[PDB]
Amino acid sequence: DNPWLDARVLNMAHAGGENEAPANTLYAFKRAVKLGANMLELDVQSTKDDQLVVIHNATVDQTTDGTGKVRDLTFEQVHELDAAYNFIPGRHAVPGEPPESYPLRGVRTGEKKPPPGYQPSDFAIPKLADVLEAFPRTPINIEIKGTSDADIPSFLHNAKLLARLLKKTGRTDFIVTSFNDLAVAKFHLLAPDIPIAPGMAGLAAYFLLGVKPMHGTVALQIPVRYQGLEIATPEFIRRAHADGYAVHVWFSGTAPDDEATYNRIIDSCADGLMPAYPALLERILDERGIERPGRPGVDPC
């Protein structure tokens, strides 16, 4: 009796929609919900002063105008940065290109008017607390990040910080995960009432050998392909559902962000997709009349 098996089909904005909007910004998130996304996917790191901010990389270089590790800088240092400084529609964030490539560079900083309905703070690195305040009713998928693949304490620390904040909200409509299994395990010990999805080790043990993942796991969040191996296949998704696990599929290089690819995944009975183009997926789901939570529609299986 797992309520996430009934939550389908989900349009989960990947970082708010990294190809249609500046990733991990209050703008991208607010936009993504207005377009009808069922859930927000985001990434969290911590500042020098133990503040959980929403940002994927461990450095601010790629998505902003600054430099250095997030853990190395004040929250006030990082809130001043232009979090759309390198955003190009259809290409996420690529620095070092002609300045007219970036339609939102400069609105955070005050040199260009914000789009109708938004203020400059909507284009900075936000506190996770701010996002939770802005979306009290919207479910949030939260991935724990670290500063390096060898710096395991940094993951463990963010998991400690995340459990505290999330316990204070008294909400349980989250899914918390990370690539680092220890970090998920540490989070599950400190916040046992928050749903989780396993790390790579848990994922591989379940996928390659059938070892059921950590208790409290309520979905598997998988790429489409991994090192040449097709992961989001109907046969695998059939097996996960049989064991009582929802399946959410992300892309981010492992497969295109296509109409065709999205449709393959929908047809494979995935319960949620994590698109870089969430507006696109909405159009696809609406045209196909696919069932959504609380909305009538057809089941692809």
Please report, as ranges, the residues that interact with Ca ion according to CB under 5 A: 43, 143
Q: How far is CA 52 from CA 162, 164, 182, 247, in A?
A: 7, 11, 19, 27
CB of 24 or CB of 268, closer to Ca ion: 24
Residue nearest to Ca ion (CB): 143
The DSSP code sequence of 267-291 is HTT-SEEE-S-HHHHHHHHHHHTB-
- Least separation in angstroms between residue 145's CB and Ca ion is 8
Is residue 165 a contact partner of residue 145, using CB atoms and an 8 Å limit?
no
- Least separation in angstroms between residue 43's CB and Ca ion is 4
Q: Which is the catalytic residue, given 14, 157, 188, 248?
A: 14
143 is in an annotated binding site: yes
CB atoms within 10 A of CB 62: 15
CB of 81 or CB of 175, closer to Ca ion: 175
Chain position carrying tokens 């009808």: 36
- Least separation in angstroms between residue 247's CB and Ca ion is 16
Q: Which is the catalytic residue, given 56, 157, 188, 241?
A: 56
6 is in an annotated binding site: no
CA–CA gap between residue 201 and residue 190 (Å, rounded): 20
157 is catalytic: no
14 is catalytic: yes
For residue 10, the surrounding DSSP H or E stretch is: strand 10-14
CB of 185 or CB of 276, closer to Ca ion: 276
CA–CA gap between residue 109 and residue 301 (Å, rounded): 48
41 is in an annotated binding site: yes
CB of 55 or CB of 88, closer to Ca ion: 55
- Least separation in angstroms between residue 54's CB and Ca ion is 10
Measured on CA atoms in the order 277, 130, 197, 194, is the torsion positive or negative?
negative
Per the annotation, binding residues for Ca(2+) are 41, 43, 143
Active site residues: 14, 56
Give the residue ranges of the annotated binding site.
41, 43, 143
